[PDB]
Amino acid sequence: MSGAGSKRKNVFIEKATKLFTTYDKMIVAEADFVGSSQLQKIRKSIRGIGAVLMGKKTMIRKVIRDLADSKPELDALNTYLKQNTCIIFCKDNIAEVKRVINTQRVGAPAKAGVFAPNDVIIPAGPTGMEPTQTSFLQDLKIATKINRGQIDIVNEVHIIKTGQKVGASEATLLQKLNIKPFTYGLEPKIIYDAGACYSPSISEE
């Protein structure tokens, strides 16, 4: 029916509306790749100053709280209808929350079909290819060229962003080699206010 099932949804409703008017400043972060080992270090620094509270697509159950506050949900930057989000709350440290969130990032190779971070460089050249792994390249339908004395498909630039799925072959290549394209964890989309947006601008530092 509604407000039922295994590990109830109604319970989560209480967290996502009643504790959404008990903090000064907020930051809408992106969690589409960070793990639990990486994330529990950002549930100590953030937990001490405020919290990380979101039931996930429970912003449409916030409309009772928007009677007084008038909060943007689809109106702010990123409509949140293509990517997962986890809202960061803070009241003690409103200045020292935007950068310590980015300090706990950990770099690693890409995955098969992942949404992926902002920056994703594919391995290429002498360092980014092995001589034994040319077979794989040959297998692919895309063209292979001899650049810098090494057989490679040649691409060392950004071809995908946040909310664009990486190719399988590319992912495989990344995994095989020791190339880590970018350091990622909880990445802020925008800074967020109570009933408004404080800064509609990305801050990865």
Next chain:
Amino acid sequence: IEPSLVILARKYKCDKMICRKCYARLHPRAVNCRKKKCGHSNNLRPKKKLLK
């Protein structure tokens, strides 16, 4: 490279549910035989793995 090949081989030969009242080779998600001798049935077991 070589393991990939092996897995491919397995895919079409070894990983298939193999019925019971029938011995028809089906497919890993099977819950029937598609044989009007078997009577479709719901006795599907996996096809066994290699042993020396």
Next chain:
Amino acid sequence: MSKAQAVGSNYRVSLGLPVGAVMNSADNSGAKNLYVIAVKGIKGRLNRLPSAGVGDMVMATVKKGKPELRKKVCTGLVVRQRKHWKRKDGVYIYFEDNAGVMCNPKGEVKGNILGPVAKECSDLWPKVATNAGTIV
């Protein structure tokens, strides 16, 4: 068993010794006779006696000899037969007597063969060929 021959098997050489055929042992062993029990490679019919031409392996028993061999079904080879047969040559050969030899199940004659050995037999079994005095 074995047979390893040659490369066909001949070029058949006529029924001559049905079963219950007594023949000469023609070999340095205790045996004088060889009563033919049956012939190897005889799929039946319905009232048809298994028969051995030449170079047929023949399960046999020694009717008359020394008693160390007797009362014992044993493998042998028909080495010449009185019943004539046509060869490739064109000519029909026949021999003075029906005769066999003693052998292993694989076709290994351990004695040396007395009398003519018949070319077909020689062609078939290598050991037999080796131990022949006369193949003609």
Next chain:
Amino acid sequence: MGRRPARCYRYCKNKPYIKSRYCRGVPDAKIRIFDLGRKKASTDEFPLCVHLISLEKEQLSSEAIEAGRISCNKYISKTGGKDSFHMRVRVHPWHVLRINKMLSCAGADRLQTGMRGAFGKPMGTVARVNIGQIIFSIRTRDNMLANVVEALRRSSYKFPGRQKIVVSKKWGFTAYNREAYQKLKADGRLMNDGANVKVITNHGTLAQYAKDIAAAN
């Protein structure tokens, strides 16, 4: 049976024939045990009654019954313990089967043995059920309306004919429902022996409540 196909005595035919002073020679029944699990447990513990009723009118054999009960007894340890089961079976094999044997089974005769005095010697027993008779009751906790259901399913295969299975609306081995039983319990009108409620009357008990009311549940 072991001697014959049970399809010989599949259906109820002839008048009931029982171990008596007129039929003393009968062999002993295959089941001499109508027990399963903790029988000492109170009816107030186990509130769920899963039956098995024979959907057909038939002669359901002693052997068959035996087979059934052990199937349930081999679906006691794999799921739960013995302290969630109770069973009085509710179908004894009272009827006894006559078997007129013949000498020439492998031998021969020119109709010498025959039917010249055809009476059958007692050999075997059987329980004569109907289309709505209970052939296995399981009293149990409310945490097993799957496992005793599946025990009884197993039993069903041991028996001739189609076999319905039902979860009752009563406390097992008692006339009262769960809405009525509970009411009684609340009121103090209920009273327990050991595995059977007595229930306190008002017709017999006009003014003698000094024993019934003392031991109310």
Next chain:
Amino acid sequence: MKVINSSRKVQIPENVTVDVKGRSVKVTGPRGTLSKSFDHASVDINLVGKKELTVDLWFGNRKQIACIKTITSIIENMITGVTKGYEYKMRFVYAHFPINVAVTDGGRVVEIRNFFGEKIVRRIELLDGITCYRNEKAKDEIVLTGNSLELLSQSCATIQLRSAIKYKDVRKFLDGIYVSERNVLESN
């Protein structure tokens, strides 16, 4: 039964042109021309303009209803093939004898001499329209290409099934030519 079906629509890109006459379509694209018939009852199969082809079914049984979707899918496939062709990469493998494959585009045929040490030259003609080409990555693959998926897949299947020893244990050997990448399409 007899519920009244809705439409099933399939998009048409402006690269191709889809004809239809007597419940039997013909896609025409840059790559070539595929044709297919569909025979059913009250199956109105029409063109909206040159952007949507619609398949309908007035009062369908469940069986009847099911086939509509299939039809739609098949026409979609055709559309795909005639604008950007299907490519099936087949990898071949055995753990000792090197399996000798070589293509003949004149005959339009693959031939396989060795595979289990079988001295036969195991060959079969590829289906009409489709071709293979000897692509190398370490002497491991052959890549079939075509317009029609239906034909292409059949071709692949034929050389898969043939390439397999049919005596004793199936798990012990890896002998065969198997389809690895089938979802890929030739680049334009």
Next chain:
RNA sequence: CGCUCAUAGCGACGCUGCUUUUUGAUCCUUCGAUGUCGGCUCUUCUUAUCAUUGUGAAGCAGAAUUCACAAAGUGUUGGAUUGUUCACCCACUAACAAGGAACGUGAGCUGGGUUUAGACCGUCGUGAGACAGGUUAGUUUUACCCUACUGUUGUCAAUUGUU
């Protein structure tokens, strides 16, 4: 049970069928007479497939074996003992699977047995005699009719006018 693992293969305690290749049950037909048994010979049919063909399972590595399906298209033996079907052995074989047709087949045979009269023995019986005990000797009649089949003429009495 199968080291593990209910169902690779088996499968208790139970239950449900089928077949008429067992023996009974019965007495419906036949007692003014349907020649009993086995064998030889010959044909056809059945599938509940032993082998061979194509397949699929397996505790299928290989070889070997076991399990199942489509399949009755083709095969499925020589012998010692016994009247024996049955039985048991020897030898071959790819295999030497099971069955039906008035328990296929006596104007087809044989007559070894059963199965008349002679006779011997054993046990029984006072005896005549008995024996579902053993032994030995003991008539196998008729097709030329009808159909069926094998072949052979001949009429398509317009073989389409005749040859």
Next chain:
RNA sequence: AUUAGCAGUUUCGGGGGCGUAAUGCUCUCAGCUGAUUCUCAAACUCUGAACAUUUUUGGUAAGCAGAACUGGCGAUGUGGGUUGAACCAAAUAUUGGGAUAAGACGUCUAACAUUCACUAAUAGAUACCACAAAAGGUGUUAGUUCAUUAAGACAGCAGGACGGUGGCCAUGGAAGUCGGUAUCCGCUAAGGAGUGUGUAACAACUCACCUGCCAAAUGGACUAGCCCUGAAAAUGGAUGA
């Protein structure tokens, strides 16, 4: 004829336990008694009605043997059931017309129209009567009940699947994952002291669990219709064709 616990005896018949020990005290345990409970009957009964079909005994059964009632057959055709001693309609002097009965009404074959589902089988198609079952089916048809869902369900695809900690047991080695017992807390949207693959054991992979994308229904356990499996036999072949 038979099943079960329970109460009061309980010291007793016997085992112990209880104060150093007792026909002294209480248990399981037998026996006695009481109130409940399961089932029970041709040869029990308080009570107690109204060849065929029905009643009915022997028999595993029979187209077997034997009874009761009624109706047939025999003694009897006719119409129907393809065919038929007994079934159904219905009784038989000789005819005509009429209208019916059972039963039929594609064609054989006298007789048709309209209309709603069901059957996807080589099925199925006139009771007696020429067969068929237990048990199976994500075949379809309808139905029952329960649960989930705009709090983002269902399906797919994607992300995560952590700390105490390799808990405590045991041991070449068992570190979530041969096996024994407890099975809690932190941090969380959420993550079993863990569902298998794997490893001397790990690692690695996988699942429960949670969530993104998409966008309206979805999941299940039963029920009973037809249909399929179950379903093998001998001349060629029988819904009569």
